[PDB]
Amino acid sequence: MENLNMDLLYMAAAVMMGLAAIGAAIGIGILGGKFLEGAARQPDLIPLLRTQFFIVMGLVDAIPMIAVGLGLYVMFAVA
């Protein structure tokens, strides 16, 4: 109950920032890897900046899961 509560809040964060933060990780990797291989043959002036949008597309993916996993981790510390 008290134990189950810490179990609930633990596995909640692992379903949360497990799921998205890895989806983030691969997309920064996939998209931002390929998108800079667009920037390379071009100058790295303009399409280096669009390549930001893509690694950032990844960073935002993990953000609400790491902040909710933070809220779940602080709630674990109470429980």
Side-chain angles (χ1 to χ4, degrees):
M1 287 181 180
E2 184 178 63
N3 298 300
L4 294 173
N5 216 245
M6 294 184 288
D7 192 62
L8 199 296
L9 296 162
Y10 247 122
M11 73 86 188
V15 161
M16 279 288 182
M17 31 168 191
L19 193 159
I22 64 91
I26 54 178
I28 297 161
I30 293 171
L31 260 74
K34 183 61 180 64
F35 256 125
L36 205 82
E37 291 296 298
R41 50 272 293 116
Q42 292 181 253
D44 295 290
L45 200 288
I46 299 296
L48 180 138
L49 99 83
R50 66 97 193 271
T51 300
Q52 316 255 248
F53 203 79
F54 307 105
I55 62 177
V56 174
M57 161 173 298
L59 287 166
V60 293
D61 199 60
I63 246 291
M65 261 73 259
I66 221 294
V68 163
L70 230 166
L72 284 162
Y73 201 77
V74 169
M75 193 174 172
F76 151 66
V78 176

